[PDB]
Design a protein around this ligand. Structure first.
Ligand SMILES: *[C@@H]1O[C@H](CO)[C@@H](O[C@@H]2O[C@H](CO)[C@@H](O)[C@H](O)[C@H]2NC(C)=O)[C@H](O)[C@H]1NC(C)=O
Ligand SMILES: *[C@@H]1O[C@H](CO)[C@@H](O[C@@H]2O[C@H](CO)[C@@H](O)[C@H](O)[C@H]2NC(C)=O)[C@H](O)[C@H]1NC(C)=O
Ligand SMILES: CC(C)(C)c1cc(C(=O)O)n(Cc2ccccc2)n1
Length: 654
């Protein structure tokens, strides 16, 4: 089959141990900027003392800098507030004496090399929020519920507004916030006012009233608005930062239900709407590019309370792929996969050489099911949720169960190399997995009940493995650490020695395992989303194909830190399949044509009344958001006003 030679040597000298002398309590880990190797470990003990370690070599060596934080006690509730991109900004929130006028923070703007102790004119209630546009601009909520803003990275603060419940950093240093008038935040629930500040407190605009909550998603601003002399509430959307608002074409909810943004981007949002009264499920809706028109995408979508378990996963290694869990009528849980951004959802293909477990009503015919957030929450034997990396094309790794529903059995690990069209059992039993060098290295740690001393690796995308002993003295494993972006060749194995417990981190560099750097010949041409290769339209997802250049499973070379995923789009001809029904239109049975509804019912009728001209004047069809098809079919429809078909039945005044 093929394996790596003299590998023990290549890794032996590349295995860097480091012990953590004083360690117990809340033990945090933080990476500081890309391509820096900066790791910040922070431990807190309760009698009192706080330990702070720093690295500059991808966690191979740490240098105790507890001295830099003037040997004070840090409140892990706030954690290490790290600055965007490579700003190098780090904020630590220290525990102060009960009497104190305000809180105290430690700030570094040089990747934790030098810290500034800074006392504050208030006590923080929230972690400090860095501005996306300006890393030197911060905002925070006082314990007294006041909005404070720093224009100089924590040095100088000023209470820009008082009675606030929630504040968010928008695009280009703009802030949005909910403001209560009466008692508290919990008292004015659905009575709050939504405000905006373009100039950091200098000017304000009340962009909302009778607000339950608000949130940002891609290009949209959503806000649940409470009904007048009514218990219910509904979503309203604003593409212009609160200047104009349109009602969303979504159902309304009572006080016992919630709305959740499952995923949002520049084209659309996946919106979860809770089903009425303690169901433990809801319905997924996909939006239009305006965030106004909504297409029902998935029924009985498993999502617990607002807080807040769902198996909703974006399969980041391949475009338009998402996986989630649905509740079956017999109260069993099934995994569903979408390949066209929730257009159509279906079961996952069962790994060819895998057996149908006890959950299957058929010995030979069934599907793969995935363990995610929910399995974990129900204390199942799941050490890790699915993992996909945008730089490792088509790779998905997850804990599975082959059958008709999610088994409670001890799961094995499964791998897909084509973004979830086809799967194969990667490893037997639970494991901790990580992707390195954009899929050049796959790493695995066994999830055992007893100490471990070995690590497994694959240079052919989990098709062939090679066990290596990182330590003579085994450890009780906790987790892995690798630099966000899956580009390093460095991995930190964490755990503790068998007791008299001492924490350790064995970091391994795979520089000598993958000595040769990849070249043109190591890459092959791969069409994503291929289904029927003899078809002109094969691979068309959202109107276009993407033909990639992918690393050969056989090739055992290094992509490098500077690797660019290379693809080539091919613009397909529009079919009606590239359009979704606009307001008031529907798709009968199997047919792909959009016919007008005989008569609007439910939340559709509500919108037909309480909505605006633009959205109701259709245009039987609308192009799927993010759909880039050209040519072919264009359903050229005269923009017909529908606020006649609703009012048609209602007797109306003069
Ligand atoms: C699902 O994940 C993908 C990949 O992370 C998101 O798309 C990427 O978004 C960035 C935004 O800057 C683009 O630069 C990339 O080109 C996108 N990659 C792909 C694979 O398309 C996507 O938006 C996520 N889905 C949702 C609905 O949020
Ligand atoms: C793994 O960690 C080492 C550090 O232990 C990284 O080494 C850095 O390499 C870049 C060039 O590749 C240099 O500019 C740095 O100065 C190096 N730092 C040190 C301390 O040697 C290495 O890049 C990491 N591996 C990957 C692929 O990210
Ligand atoms: C972000 C946005 C889409 C506007 C939204 C609206 C709702 C809701 O009224 O349920 N939620 C969930 C929620 C519930 C209670 C408190 C905060 C957030 N999120």
């Amino acid at each position: 089959c093929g394996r790596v030679r003299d590998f023990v040597a290549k890794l032996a000298n590349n295995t860097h141990q480091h012990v953590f002398d004083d360690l117990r309590g809340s033990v945090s880990l933080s990476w500081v900027g890309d391509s820096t190797g900066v790791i910040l470990v922070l431990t807190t003990f309760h009698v009192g003392q706080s330990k702070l370690y720093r690295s500059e070599d991808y966690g191979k060596n740490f240098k105790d800098i507890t001295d830099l934080i003037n040997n004070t006690f840090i409140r892990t509730e706030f954690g290490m507030a790290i600055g965007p991109e490579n700003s190098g900004k780090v904020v630590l929130t220290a525990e102060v004496s009960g009497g104190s006028r305000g809180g105290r923070i430690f700030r570094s703007s040089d990747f934790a090399k030098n810290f500034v102790q800074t006392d504050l004119p208030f006590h923080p209630l929230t972690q400090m929020m860095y501005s996306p546009q300006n890393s030197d601009y911060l905002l925070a909520l006082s314990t007294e519920n006041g909005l404070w803003v720093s224009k100089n990275f924590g040095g100088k603060w000023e209470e820009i507004h008082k009675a606030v419940c929630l504040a968010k950093w928008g695009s280009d240093n703009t802030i949005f916030f909910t403001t209560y008038a009466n008692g508290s935040c919990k008292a004015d629930l659905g009575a709050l006012e939504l405000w905006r500040t373009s100039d950091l407190g200098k000017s304000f605009k009340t962009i909302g009233v009778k607000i339950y909550s608000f949130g940002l998603g891609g290009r949209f601003l959503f806000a649940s608005v409470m009904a007048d002399k009514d218990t219910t509430r509904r979503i309203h959307v604003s593409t212009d930062q609160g200047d104009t608002w349109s009602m969303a074409q979504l159902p309304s909810v009572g006080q016992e239900q919630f709305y959740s943004i499952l995923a949002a981007n520049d084209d659309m949002v996946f919106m979860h709407v809770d089903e009425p009264g303690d169901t433990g499920f809801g319905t997924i809706f996909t939006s239009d590019d305006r965030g106004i028109v909504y297409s029902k995408s998935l029924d009985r979508h498993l999502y617990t309370t607002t807080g807040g378990e769902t198996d909703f996963t974006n399969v980041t290694s391949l475009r338009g792929v998402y996986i989630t869990s649905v509740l079956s009528e017999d109260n069993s849980i099934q995994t569903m996969i979408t390949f066209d951004q929730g257009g159509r959802w279906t079961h996952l293909r069962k790994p060819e050489n895998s057996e149908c477990d006890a959950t299957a009503k058929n010995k030979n015919e069934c599907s793969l099911h995935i363990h995610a957030s929910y399995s974990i929450s129900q204390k199942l034997n799941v050490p890790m949720a699915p993992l996909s990396e945008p730089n490792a094309v088509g790779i998905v790794i997850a804990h599975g169960s082959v059958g008709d529903a999610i088994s409670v059995m001890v799961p094995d690990v499964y791998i897909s190399d084509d973004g979830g069209y086809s799967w194969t059992k990667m490893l037997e039993g639970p494991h901790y997995y990580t992707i390195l060098d954009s899929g050049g290295i796959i790493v695995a740690i066994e999830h055992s009940s007893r100490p471990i001393n070995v690590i497994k690796f694959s240079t052919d995308e989990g098709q062939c493995w090679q066990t290596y002993t990182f330590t003579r003295d085994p450890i009780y494993f906790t987790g892995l650490a690798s630099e966000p972006g899956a580009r390093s060749m460095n991995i930190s194995i964490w755990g503790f020695t068998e007791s008299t417990s001492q924490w350790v981190s064995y970091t391994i560099d795979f520089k000598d395992i993958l000595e040769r750097n990849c070249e043109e010949k190591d890459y092959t041409i791969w069409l994503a989303h291929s289904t029927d290769p003899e078809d002109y339209e094969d691979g068309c997802i959202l109107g276009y194909k993407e033909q990639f250049l992918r690393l050969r499973k056989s090739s055992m070379c290094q992509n490098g830190r500077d690797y660019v995923v290379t693809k080539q789009p091919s613009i397909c001809l529009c079919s009606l399949e590239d359009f979704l029904c606009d307001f008031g239109y529907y798709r009968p049975e199997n047919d792909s044509k959009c016919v007008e509804q005989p008569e609007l019912k439910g939340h559709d009728l509500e919108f037909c009344l309480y909505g605006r001209e633009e959205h109701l004047t259709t245009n039987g069809y609308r192009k799927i958001p993010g759909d880039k098809c050209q040519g072919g079919v264009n359903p050229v429809r005269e923009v017909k006003d529908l606020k006649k078909k609703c009012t048609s039945n209602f007797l109306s005044p003069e």
